[PDB]
Design a protein around this ligand. Structure first.
Ligand SMILES: CCCCCCCCCCCCCCCCCC(=O)OC[C@H](COP(=O)([O-])OCC(O)COP(=O)([O-])OC[C@@H](COC(=O)CCCCCCCCCCCCCCCCC)OC(=O)CCCCCCCCCCCCCCCCC)OC(=O)CCCCCCCCCCCCCCCCC
Ligand SMILES: CCCCCCCCCCCCCCCCCC(=O)OC[C@H](COP(=O)([O-])OCC(O)COP(=O)([O-])OC[C@@H](COC(=O)CCCCCCCCCCCCCCCCC)OC(=O)CCCCCCCCCCCCCCCCC)OC(=O)CCCCCCCCCCCCCCCCC
Ligand SMILES: CCCCCCCCCCCCCCCCCC(=O)OC[C@H](COP(=O)([O-])OCC(O)COP(=O)([O-])OC[C@@H](COC(=O)CCCCCCCCCCCCCCCCC)OC(=O)CCCCCCCCCCCCCCCCC)OC(=O)CCCCCCCCCCCCCCCCC
Ligand SMILES: CCCCCCCCCCCCCCCCCC(=O)OC[C@H](COP(=O)([O-])OCC(O)COP(=O)([O-])OC[C@@H](COC(=O)CCCCCCCCCCCCCCCCC)OC(=O)CCCCCCCCCCCCCCCCC)OC(=O)CCCCCCCCCCCCCCCCC
Ligand SMILES: CCCCCCCCCCCCCCCCCC(=O)OC[C@H](COP(=O)([O-])OCC(O)COP(=O)([O-])OC[C@@H](COC(=O)CCCCCCCCCCCCCCCCC)OC(=O)CCCCCCCCCCCCCCCCC)OC(=O)CCCCCCCCCCCCCCCCC
Ligand SMILES: CCCCCCCCCCCCCCCCCC(=O)OC[C@H](COP(=O)([O-])OCC[N+](C)(C)C)OC(=O)CCCCCCCCCCCCCCCCC
Ligand SMILES: CCCCCCCC/C=C/CCCCCCCC(=O)OC[C@H](COP(=O)(O)OCCN)OC(=O)CCCCCCC/C=C/CCCCCCCC
Ligand SMILES: CCCCCCCCCCCCO[C@@H]1O[C@H](CO)[C@@H](O[C@H]2O[C@H](CO)[C@@H](O)[C@H](O)[C@H]2O)[C@H](O)[C@H]1O
Lengths: 383, 103, 53, 85, 62, 168, 231, 135, 80, 105
């Protein structure tokens, strides 16, 4: 979304109340995260707590491993509720953006003020706390959805093009899953058909081998600030933490069937944090429930059985596929009755163009026959 | 759909290209530019006479001397420099007057 | 008036996908064609047998 | 000689001269003007980036104690190998 | 890449396309400048500069 | 206070008029260089310590575990001692931006503070000098401008074989 | 010293603006190997091996606008300087080298230590590693030197031959009207043949040298690429 | 907020200077947008007429520049050095004398290294002025 | 054919001999520009761009331009 | 060329098997392993840690080809002359009777 004066006024008016609300949310989220971190350190697996090293097979660069460095706390409901987890995730996003802004301010002293003016003129990178009314929150959500639309297609195309150019599926079912994975949101994708793509891509690329450019595109699509990007293991850590929290909340909801009892707005927010339900689509409860059930089905029974989610890259592609709107087409079909090269009519045809028209026109067969006969006669005379 | 080359304006695309596509090359280019302007940005008068002119240095008018004369006149006039000061001449003003009367 | 092709090409190029040939995808999709009536009959018979069993 | 002269740029338009001292001093004045305001603390990375490397280079130059002679960078004649002055 | 275009079969056809007309004009200039130089620089009345030994590029570049 | 903005002009002038550099000023600059090196060393030690403290447990086990390159016996003893010391207590082992900040911000702050205060110390030292450089520094801090050709204006000391210019 | 000058491409820039205001396909490329690095299917690389395509294409365009058009008399190669070419090659080569080094994967350099464990480490393998580390920089220097010298020599030869041809054509054409016309005709035919041969040789050599210039960079890149197999 | 980062933010109407732009595009497209106009890395087209038209024009303007701007300097230097060493001394001559001198310079250029050396080497016993004539 | 390095393109035949033999040629429908069409000289009857302007006339025009360029100073010399 | 896999802990030969310039530096000579460069090279090769030999070399070359080369060329100290112009330590001191300006206060 582009900046505007109205949004600038809105953010300037709500700047200090927004900061105060952000501080209160910071205290609350610090408490929640302290609880979660204590539980992880106490009951977490040895590899997860010790931060086991997983190196790539080509350049031996360490990155988070989905199996080892990600752990689902099935018993987190005792200490932390679902709403607390959602609050923590939202605060994590807001805190990331605020931390980047504060780092810029500290680095550049008082020279960041005009850049701050640019920042407050757009809702893309402002915290949710700056919105004090429903309309402001709706506009902020619209800006976030616009950024997601802007970013996701690049990530999807990167993944699909790299895989298709450097590899092909093994069997027909994998082919169908791969083809249906990257369909536009206007059609409904069956998670059962699409799931094998996860194993296929695990064969191709895991979350531990994700490239830095693809990571940048993903972070753009997740409304995660990317500047300064730095090494790939920082925003990678952010992504891992966010999706670990999301998986814990998803396990809690699936086990306790909270989504059925979840209200309409809370359900919409829950889907939105999973990048499943844009607000501009004006989805009803039926569609939200369908998408959430499809997401749970894609996670698969193994998620509940052992807390193991499918490949994170494929999961991100699948969820972001809802932001891959059909390519725009505006204009009545009658426009196809016009002509594009009328301005050349005055130039006419030169000798070469006339020759080409004569040779390849409706008389082409006659000219070909005459030419071939003449050439044959000349060749016979030569011999 | 959004694409950097088609949607962004030229300056924005330039910054993106040289910051997230070819940043190391830009850094090396800046390093080399700094080196060139720090060590290869001087030309002595003799070097200019030898190679600095297309057909050769026109000694019959010595434009370098005129250029330096204009430079020094401008500096003296603007900065209000007393070229008769003993440090410039190595002798007192009275000695300078004595020399002028002598020669 | 063929927006899907435009978007895919532009996105592929903007993500460093300069190459214009996709032998693997073509190999996967080259032999695709609408089936003949007899082939449809055979497929329907197979489906009916599967459903019955 | 003449064939060698054909490998020169053919669109030279203007040449400008400036002493190292003068433009270095002007650059220092600009840097001081932009780094002077109170809203840029001395501990900011920008200020250190501006000042520390220059200070280090100048200190290295001052500390230098070389047994050989380095001819003036901006002499009138530097083409004579047997006349460093 | 030299793939196609109008190609006159002989000289008389160079007037069948404006581009080749300009080309033949240029060729005429090119080839006719040489006889002009022959006539001008081998003329009977052409005289070497008396002061030619006063200065030369050979002493300048030396 | 921003001493670098004042001191840059003085340093440039000294480089331009380095001939009048007394041995005292040379010693001052050598001490400044030595203190810069010391600050670099201490900042690097702090950075290494912070990195080691925040290192992951598995990373520490791999680094300070078998095999031993030399296998002398002292190497293994030292590695085991360090590994036990690090793994005994609980350590905050962040990753990503957090580790970057923790390891860098303290180091940058320390290095910058030490360098700034050493620059102030050098300014004081040059103020206390009784040479032409000290006089130039005092005049710069008084009038705010650098007075070039000062050594010849006040007739600073010259070698016995070069005093003819002052003969006026 | 600040010299203000202009490149000799303004007319070519005008032509590019005129003829490329609308899209056109490209199917012939001087260095096509920058697009097809992998030939065995199921091999893929996590490194940005296709980052060099844009620079390769732009360099080819720039050097072709300069060198190929330099065959036209009085056309100027504005960039024809040894140290300028050194700066260009330094930029490209060192940028890619620092991209590989910033990866902070020391094992990537294991192949520098040539030979096997059988060879003496200190007296054979270490010397070979030294020589190869030197050879990288020598490859950079050789690339830039070759590019400079080819053009310099070709244009020197062209200028000298053209001067000789002008001299004989102007000051000895009258022999056509004389009894020794046959010798002049033979010499003129030989000169025409030589003119054509030199122009063809230079045309081919310019493109070939651009190909080699890009291939050296691509070889640098390939020397440190590792391909994973799909499963 | 001050300036847009998107090219979609138009500064003019779609019909601004439509006609001249269409004429310019017609000029561009007629010969270039053809199947046989296959470029080699965008620099070498496939249309013969493009070569036939562009090579002569390039040569013509380059030669005009070289003759009226570059070699003129050498010609003037020769005239000045050989006829007094000052511009006024040359201007003291008539136009015909200057023409003679410049044509002799052209002769020297044409001879280059493949011609008699008496044009710049004074044979012993020659009565013509030497190098110290004006000194 | 060729004019220096420029070679005249030739259309590849598309019809087989059997089909070709069954083709009836009617030059009455052909344009006047291309009648008795010859692959070795397809532009023999092509109209001139300018009526009465021959190739030799343009060649002579260029030669005259060269002569002017080389001889104008001889008749109207100018001082330095 | 091909992918590199680090050796397992059990695949690494013992230190005693490594050879130095003259011979193995076994018991009573272990502390000499630190000083023997060839022994360290052989140990690194045996442990597949060849980069310790290659990385320092290449980087060094780069450092010379990039930053130190020009520094030496432009600012390096050449060989001293036979007759040396030592400093008399007479320049710089203020003249007698000069009244230096007061220090800041
Ligand atoms: C005055 C000197 C200045 C020096 C120059 C500085 C120049 C600017 C550089 C940037 C400096 C920092 C800017 C503020 C950031 C805000 C604080 C913060 O870390 O936020 C958390 C957050 C952590 O991100 P993450 O990815 O979630 O962390 C992953 C970890 O696993 C997270 O671990 P976890 O998963 O276990 O979760 C833990 C989480 C759990 O907690 C929570 O969830 C609760 C919330 C906690 C965080 C709250 C942050 C709030 C931010 C907004 C503040 C208000 C802004 C208001 C603005 C308007 C004001 C009018 O709690 C944390 O966030 C703790 C993180 C670790 C602490 C990092 C701080 C270390 C430095 C401070 C100590 C310095 C001591 C000096 C001693 C000197 C001795 C001599 O910070 C960021 O978003 C990262 C920074 C983004 C910008 C990066 C820019 C480049 C930086 C390069 C630095 C290189 C070294 C320095 C030299 C530079 C030379 C070029
Ligand atoms: C046709 C001609 C047209 C005109 C052309 C003009 C001529 C241009 C010629 C040359 C152009 C190419 C130059 C390339 C250079 C090499 C670049 C390179 O190697 O980059 C590697 C690498 C590439 O970056 P990346 O993170 O991988 O991704 C870059 C993408 O663009 C990230 O993209 P993304 O999509 O992933 O993320 C998008 C979004 C994502 O959203 C976010 O990230 C959220 C918002 C983040 C806000 C910023 C957070 C910063 C946190 C602290 C960073 C560390 C600070 C270190 C300490 C301070 C050092 C100064 O981020 C943003 O929207 C960033 C907004 C930044 C706006 C400022 C851009 C510059 C405009 C000019 C202003 C300055 C003018 C000075 C000169 C004039 C003075 C009178 O750079 C970095 O790692 C970034 C380090 C940044 C350090 C701070 C800046 C240092 C430079 C000096 C600053 C001086 C300030 C002076 C202030 C005023 C004094 C009076
Ligand atoms: C990650 C990157 C990967 C990609 C790489 C891509 C590039 C390719 C790689 C190759 C590089 C290409 C070059 C590109 C251009 C870059 C710029 C450039 O060349 O600038 C050079 C440029 C050269 O200077 P210059 O301008 O030519 O002027 C020359 C003057 O010397 C300047 O004067 P100054 O006042 O600035 O002083 C400079 C000073 C710099 O040094 C210092 O200031 C002092 C030392 C600083 C130490 C820093 C911290 C180190 C760690 C501390 C301890 C940690 C552990 C703590 C716990 C311990 C527990 C027990 O050096 C000296 O002057 C020499 C002093 C040496 C004293 C030796 C005394 C004798 C006893 C000690 C040695 C012998 C021990 C024998 C033991 C035997 C036992 C059996 O700048 C410098 O080198 C100096 C300034 C920067 C200093 C940075 C210091 C940190 C360096 C990194 C250390 C850590 C990483 C390395 C190890 C990694 C292991 C995994
Ligand atoms: C205006 C400000 C100007 C600032 C200038 C200073 C530089 C820029 C400042 C910072 C800018 C912001 C961005 C920095 C890069 C961020 C990278 C990143 O994303 O890291 C994420 C990463 C977090 O990810 P993680 O998953 O938690 O852990 C990484 C994984 O382990 C990763 O796992 P892995 O599988 O990748 O494991 C490999 C990993 C393992 O490494 C690590 O990640 C561990 C952390 C680094 C350890 C480094 C120390 C190693 C030991 C050194 C021993 C030295 C002994 C010397 C003794 C000398 C005795 C005389 O990487 C390595 O192996 C690399 C080792 C380093 C090799 C160094 C080679 C240097 C060659 C030098 C050539 C010659 C130079 C010239 C000549 C000099 C001599 C004359 O961060 C870190 O691990 C540490 C980040 C530290 C950031 C830099 C802090 C800067 C502090 C500056 C203080 C001084 C300021 C001075 C100001 C002056 C006035 C203006
Ligand atoms: C003191 C005497 C004066 C001089 C002062 C100089 C001060 C110097 C300060 C110290 C600098 C130190 C460092 C110097 C390093 C130099 C290195 C160097 O030369 O490298 C060669 C290198 C050669 O590059 P290149 O490959 O030839 O390509 C560069 C070209 O510019 C072509 O590249 P491109 O085509 O890719 O560029 C993009 C191009 C894209 O293409 C275009 O846009 C096409 C147009 C191209 C224009 C540029 C080409 C210029 C051609 C020659 C001049 C044209 C005629 C001028 C007539 C002057 C008559 C006296 O677009 C533009 O150029 C944008 C500008 C368009 C302007 C349009 C203006 C329209 C006005 C309409 C008004 C209507 C009023 C109606 C009123 C009605 C009332 C009723 O030069 C550069 O790269 C640029 C060097 C510039 C360095 C900065 C200099 C400082 C700025 C000085 C500005 C002075 C303005 C005041 C002048 C007033 C008249 C006297
Ligand atoms: C007729 C004679 C002909 C002679 C011909 C000789 C060959 C000339 C070839 C020229 C063309 C080819 C050029 C190739 C490129 C060469 C590059 C080169 O050598 O450059 C070296 C030079 C070295 O610079 P320097 O010469 O100013 O070195 C300073 C050293 N002292 C102070 C001791 C004198 O690089 C530069 O000039 C650029 C310097 C600025 C950019 C880098 C800044 C960061 C430095 C980091 C380390 C130090 C600071 C601490 C860390 C950072 C903290 C923030
Ligand atoms: C931000 C200014 C705050 C203070 C108020 C200054 C008002 C000065 C008087 C201005 C009168 C003329 C205004 C004409 C309309 C300007 C429209 C404009 O700014 O558009 C920018 C437009 C580019 O737009 P795009 O990026 O393509 O897309 C825009 C949509 N996002 O820029 C232009 O075309 C240039 C227009 C320049 C107009 C003049 C601006 C003058 C500003 C001066 C500010 C300094 C204070 C002046 C005080 C004056 C007191 C009498
Ligand atoms: C957080 C750390 C805070 C540290 C605060 C201060 C701690 C107490 C003082 C530390 C010791 C200082 O003592 C320091 O000794 C060295 C010599 O060894 C002196 O250095 C002197 O001799 C060395 C000898 O090589 C010369 O290179 C140097 O040019 C010269 O100045 C320093 O001028 C002096 O300051």
């Amino acid at each position: 979304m582009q900046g505007s004066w109205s949004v600038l006024k809105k953010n300037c008016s709500n700047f200090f109340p927004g900061l105060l609300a952000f501080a209160q949310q910071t205290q609350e989220a610090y408490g929640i995260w302290l609880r979660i971190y204590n539980r992880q350190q106490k009951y977490g697996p040895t590899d997860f707590v010790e931060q086991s090293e997983t190196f790539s097979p080509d350049y031996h660069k360490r990155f988070h491993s989905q199996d080892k460095n990600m752990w689902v706390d099935k018993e987190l409901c005792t200490e932390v509720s679902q709403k607390e987890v959602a609050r923590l995730m939202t605060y994590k996003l807001d805190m990331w953006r605020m931390a980047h802004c504060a780092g810029a301010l500290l680095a550049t002293g008082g020279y960041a003020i005009p850049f701050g003016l640019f920042w407050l003129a757009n809702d893309t990178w402002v915290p949710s706390s700056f919105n004090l009314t429903g309309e402001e929150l709706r506009a902020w959500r619209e800006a976030q959805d616009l950024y997601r639309y802007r970013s996701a297609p690049s990530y999807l195309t990167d993944t699909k093009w790299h895989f298709d150019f450097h590899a092909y599926p093994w069997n027909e079912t994998q082919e169908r899953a791969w083809d249906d994975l990257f369909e536009k949101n206007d059609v409904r994708r069956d998670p059962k058909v699409v799931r094998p793509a996860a194993e296929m891509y695990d064969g191709f690329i895991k979350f531990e081998l994700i490239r830095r450019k693809s990571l940048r595109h993903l972070c753009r699509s997740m409304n995660i600030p990317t500047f300064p990007m730095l090494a790939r293991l920082c925003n990678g850590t952010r992504v891992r933490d966010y999706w670990n929290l999301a998986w814990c909340e998803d396990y809690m909801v699936i086990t306790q069937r909270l989504h059925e009892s979840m209200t309409d707005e809370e359900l919409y927010d829950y889907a939105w944090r999973r990048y499943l339900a844009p607000y501009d689509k004006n989805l009803n409860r039926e569609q939200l429930m369908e998408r959430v059930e499809d997401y749970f089905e894609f996670l698969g029974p193994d998620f509940v059985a052992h807390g193991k989610a499918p490949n994170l890259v494929i999961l991100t592609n699948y969820v972001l596929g809802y932001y891959n709107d059909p390519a725009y087409l505006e204009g009545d079909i009658s426009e196809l009755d016009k002509n594009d090269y009328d301005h050349l009519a005055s130039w006419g045809k030169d000798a070469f163009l006339r020759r080409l028209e004569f040779e390849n026109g409706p008389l082409r067969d006659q000219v070909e026959a005459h030419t071939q006969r003449l050439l044959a006669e000349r060749a016979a005379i030569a011999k | 759909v959004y694409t950097r080359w088609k949607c962004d304006r030229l300056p924005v695309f330039q910054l993106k290209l040289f910051t997230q596509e070819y940043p190391m090359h830009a850094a090396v280019g800046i390093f080399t530019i700094i080196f060139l302007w720090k060590h290869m940005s001087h030309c002595s008068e003799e070097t200019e006479r030898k190679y600095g002119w297309w057909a050769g240095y026109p000694y019959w008018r010595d434009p370098i001397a005129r250029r330096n004369e204009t430079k020094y006149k401008q500096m003296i006039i603007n900065n209000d420099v007393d070229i008769t000061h003993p440090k410039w001449t190595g002798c007192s003003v009275e000695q300078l007057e004595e020399l002028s009367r002598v020669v | 008036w063929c927006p899907e092709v435009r978007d895919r090409a532009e996105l592929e190029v903007d993500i460093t996908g300069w190459q214009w040939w996709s032998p693997l995808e073509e190999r996967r999709l080259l032999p695709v064609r609408l089936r003949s009536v007899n082939e449809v009959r055979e497929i329907m018979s197979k489906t009916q047998a599967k459903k019955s069993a | 000689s003449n064939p060698a002269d054909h490998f020169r740029p053919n669109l030279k338009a203007l040449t400008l001269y400036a002493e190292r001292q003068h433009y270095v001093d002007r650059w220092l004045h600009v840097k001081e003007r932009w780094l002077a305001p109170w809203y840029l603390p001395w501990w900011s990375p920008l200020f250190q980036l501006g000042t520390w490397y220059s200070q280090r280079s100048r200190n290295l130059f001052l500390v230098e104690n070389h047994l050989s002679y380095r001819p003036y960078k901006f002499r009138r004649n530097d083409e004579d190998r047997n006349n460093p002055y | 890449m030299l793939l196609g275009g109008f190609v006159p079969r002989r000289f008389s056809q160079f007037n069948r396309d404006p581009c080749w007309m300009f080309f033949i004009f240029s060729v005429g200039f090119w080839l006719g400048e040489y006889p002009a130089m022959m006539i001008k620089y081998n003329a009977r009345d052409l005289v070497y500069d008396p002061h030619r030994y006063v200065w030369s590029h050979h002493d300048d570049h030396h | 206070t921003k001493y670098e903005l004042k001191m840059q002009y003085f340093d440039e002038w000294m480089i331009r008029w380095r001939k009048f550099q007394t041995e005292s000023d040379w010693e001052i600059e050598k001490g400044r260089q030595w203190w810069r090196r010391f600050n670099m060393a201490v900042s690097g030690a702090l950075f290494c310590g912070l990195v080691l403290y925040t290192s992951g447990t598995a990373t520490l086990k791999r680094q300070y575990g078998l095999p031993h390159f030399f296998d002398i016996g002292v190497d293994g003893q030292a590695k085991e001692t360090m590994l036990k010391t690090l793994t005994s207590r609980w350590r905050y082992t962040p990753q990503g931006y957090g580790r970057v900040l923790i390891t860098g911000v303290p180091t940058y702050i320390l290095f910058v503070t030490l360098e700034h205060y050493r620059e102030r110390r050098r300014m004081q030292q040059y103020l206390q000098q009784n040479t032409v450089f000290g006089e130039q520094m005092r005049r710069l801090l008084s009038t705010g401008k650098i007075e070039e050709y000062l050594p010849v204006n006040i007739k600073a000391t010259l070698p016995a074989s070069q005093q003819a210019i002052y003969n006026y | 010293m600040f010299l203000f000058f202009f490149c000799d491409l303004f007319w070519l820039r005008l032509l590019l603006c005129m003829y490329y205001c609308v899209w056109s396909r490209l199917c012939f490329i001087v260095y096509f190997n920058c697009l097809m690095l992998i030939f065995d299917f199921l091999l893929f690389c996590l490194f940005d091996l296709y980052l060099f395509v844009g620079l390769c294409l732009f360099l080819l365009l720039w050097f072709m606008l300069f060198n190929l058009y330099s065959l036209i008399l009085y056309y100027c190669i504005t960039y024809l300087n040894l140290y300028l070419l050194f700066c260009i090659v330094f930029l490209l080569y060192i940028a890619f080298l620092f991209l590989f080094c910033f990866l902070c994967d020391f094992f990537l350099f294991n192949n520098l230590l040539v030979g096997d464990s059988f060879m003496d480490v200190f007296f054979i393998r270490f010397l070979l590693c030294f020589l190869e580390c030197f050879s990288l920089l020598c490859r950079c220097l050789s690339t830039f030197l070759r590019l400079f010298c080819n053009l310099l020599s070709s244009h020197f030869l062209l200028l000298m031959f053209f001067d000789f041809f002008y001299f004989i054509f102007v000051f000895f054409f009258y022999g056509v009207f004389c009894y020794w016309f046959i010798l002049f005709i033979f010499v003129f035919c030989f000169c025409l043949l030589f003119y054509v041969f030199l122009y063809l040789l230079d045309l081919f050599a310019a493109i070939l040298q651009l190909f080699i210039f890009c291939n050296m960079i691509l070889q640098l890149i390939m020397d440190f690429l590792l391909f994973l197999l799909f499963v | 907020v001050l300036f847009s980062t998107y090219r979609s933010s138009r500064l003019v109407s779609k019909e601004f200077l439509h006609g001249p732009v269409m004429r310019f595009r017609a000029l561009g497209e007629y010969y270039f947008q053809r199947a046989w106009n296959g470029t080699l890395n965008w620099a070498l087209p496939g249309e013969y007429r493009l070569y036939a038209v562009m090579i002569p024009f390039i040569y013509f303007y380059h030669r005009w520049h070289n003759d009226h701007t570059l070699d003129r300097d050498h010609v003037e230097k020769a005239m000045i050095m050989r006829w007094g060493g000052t511009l006024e001394d040359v201007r003291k001559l008539s136009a015909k004398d200057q023409l003679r001198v410049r044509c002799f310079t052209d002769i020297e250029k044409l001879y280059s290294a493949y011609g008699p050396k008496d044009t710049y080497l004074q044979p012993p016993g020659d009565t013509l002025p030497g190098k110290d004539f004006y000194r | 054919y060729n004019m220096l390095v420029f070679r005249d393109p030739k259309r590849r035949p598309q019809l087989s001999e059997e089909e070709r033999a069954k083709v009836v040629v009617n030059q009455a429908e052909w344009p006047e520009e291309f009648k008795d069409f010859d692959p070795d000289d397809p532009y023999k009857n092509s109209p001139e761009i300018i009526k009465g302007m021959s190739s030799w006339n343009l060649f002579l025009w260029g030669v005259e331009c060269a002569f002017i360029y080389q001889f104008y100073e001889l008749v109207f010399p100018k001082s330095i | 060329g091909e992918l590199f896999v680090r050796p397992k802990l059990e695949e690494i030969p013992p230190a005693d098997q490594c050879r130095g310039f003259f011979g193995p530096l076994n018991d009573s000579l272990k502390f000499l392993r630190l000083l023997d460069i060839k022994w360290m090279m052989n140990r690194a090769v045996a442990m597949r840690r060849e980069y310790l030999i290659a990385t320092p070399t290449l980087f060094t070359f780069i450092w010379m080809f990039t930053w130190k080369g020009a520094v030496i060329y432009f600012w390096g100290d050449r060989a001293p002359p036979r007759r040396m112009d030592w400093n008399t330590e007479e320049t710089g001191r203020l003249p007698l009777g000069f009244k230096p300006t007061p220090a800041p206060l």
